[PDB]
Symmetry: C2
Subunit: 297 residues, 2 copies
């Protein structure tokens, strides 16, 4: 069974990595690019970008441990632990050459440790729409002059007593529509049909729990990254952020400058958090162009 339709010419498959069965969708030929999704979504957020990239690259889009059709991690949900699964998965398909990385939201959290610890394996890097876990996340406001703040969900999802699962179980479709649209500028792209697909996936009990375990490990990830960030990233990097409602704005690039020697950033106007869907044409163009500066098929 497939939770989301696989694009023509791609394969849906699984690979055991350190005892954990990871789901991924793969296609194309050439150097490897791995695309890593974020909270509320699965590999499918990349499904419009993947066919274009696959004209030049081998493209792999995994489901994060516990999300989509991937089994939960056996070690833990901190960024350093999850990054091991993703690094090993990529190196199964690119064992002798560096690969490219694109990551969205908690995809960043779950890849930054393996990037900084294996810099020679990463040719080019694209990060969009979330802070790298560090002390900056403690400076975001709980409440703003407009209302809902961007990341009050950090506390909701991290709270003990399984607060978030207990309140959201049975209401997953309602909650995800609210979460997604409240973080969007171009809300109309989230049709009821698309929301149904995403909600069905993360309503699996182990996926609802896995979703929030990433946030329960967020302070551990911060502590990990305080050590790791003593080495700056040396490979070409690009950041993307939305400039509209739900977007990180200038924060994305300004934080990345503390992490990377070679970084260019873009803020996409009229786009919120969900760049692949809200602003597919300019986001796809920026990613394809940036990755095609390196050698490709």
């Amino acid at each position: 069974a497939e939770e989301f339709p696989v694009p023509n010419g791609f394969e849906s498959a699984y690979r055991e990595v350190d005892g954990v069965k990871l789901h991924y969708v793969k296609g194309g030929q050439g150097p490897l690019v791995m695309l890593v999704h974020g909270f509320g979504q699965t590999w499918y957020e990349w499904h419009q970008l993947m066919p274009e990239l696959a004209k030049r690259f081998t493209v792999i889009a995994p489901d994060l441990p516990g999300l989509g059709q991937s089994e939960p991690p056996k070690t833990g949900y901190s960024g350093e632990q999850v990054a091991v699964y993703l690094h090993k998965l990529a190196r199964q398909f690119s064992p002798d050459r560096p690969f490219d990385l694109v990551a969205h939201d908690i995809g960043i959290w779950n890849t930054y440790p393996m990037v900084v610890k294996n810099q020679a394996d990463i040719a080019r890097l694209v990060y969009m729409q979330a802070p790298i876990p560090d002390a900056r996340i403690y400076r975001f406001p709980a409440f703003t002059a407009q209302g809902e703040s961007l990341v009050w969900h950090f506390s909701f999802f991290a709270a003990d007593d399984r607060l978030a699962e207990t309140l959201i179980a049975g209401k997953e479709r309602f909650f995800l529509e609210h979460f997604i649209k409240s973080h969007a500028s171009n809300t109309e792209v989230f049709s009821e049909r698309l929301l149904d697909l995403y909600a069905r996936s993360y309503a699996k009990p182990h996926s609802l729990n896995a979703s929030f375990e990433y946030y329960r490990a967020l302070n551990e990830s911060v502590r990990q990254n305080a050590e790791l960030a003593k080495t700056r990233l040396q490979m070409p990097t690009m950041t993307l952020a939305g400039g509209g409602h739900g977007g990180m704005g200038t924060f994305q690039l300004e934080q990345m400058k503390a992490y990377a020697e070679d970084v260019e950033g873009h803020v996409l106007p009229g786009c919120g958090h969900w760049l692949p869907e809200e602003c597919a044409a300019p986001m796809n163009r920026l990613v394809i162009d940036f990755l095609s500066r390196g050698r490709h098929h």
Copy 2:
């Protein structure tokens, strides 16, 4: 029947104020003291202070509009709108003399505008455990290195789509217990029976909604207070705050210094947000002494 047991010597009663039927519990003789509860609770959070205060004062403890046994407001939930109801309720019982005011949590939000606009009516003021709505609330963090932050619930409760009511319905007791304990230092005061009583009250559908409409009006209250605060408070004021987990710490007094010319403050070590219950005896003593001197 009554949602909470009434102390001996007090009466549970109702008064119509601007077409809204307000519930309150009243006892004692002497000058009037009005005690105003906050989120998650009702008049009952004052039930231990009320008999002691009633030895020297007439004491009235209303349910906020829409909460406890009080009808929802017919105007709105912003501080300036709600404060009219509470001001007129107090004036029904103390028309010829200024009265004292004690308020906890959103009781502050719901009384500050009538205090600042009717200063001759307010003899002494006690505020505990919540910011007055102003721009300072935009500086509290969404998340901390120890886990969930103190006031991320501001955003949760203010969200549209009836987010909070929809997620909490069917889980009202579970959520309230977590909310109370995550903002407490002393959790053992919250017996099963006490949690049951509070949960049953705010689980009434109009009370669950009313609870969060106070937060959906919070930015409006901030904007209102930006104009009202051009006039400083002149009556004797005391602030109380918990120094333990869930407490506001030094913030309570430091904010009040910007609002009030005559203010004293105390931080209670070992106490969290729910001062009348977590730290009943020292809180009661400090309030009684301040109002009695």
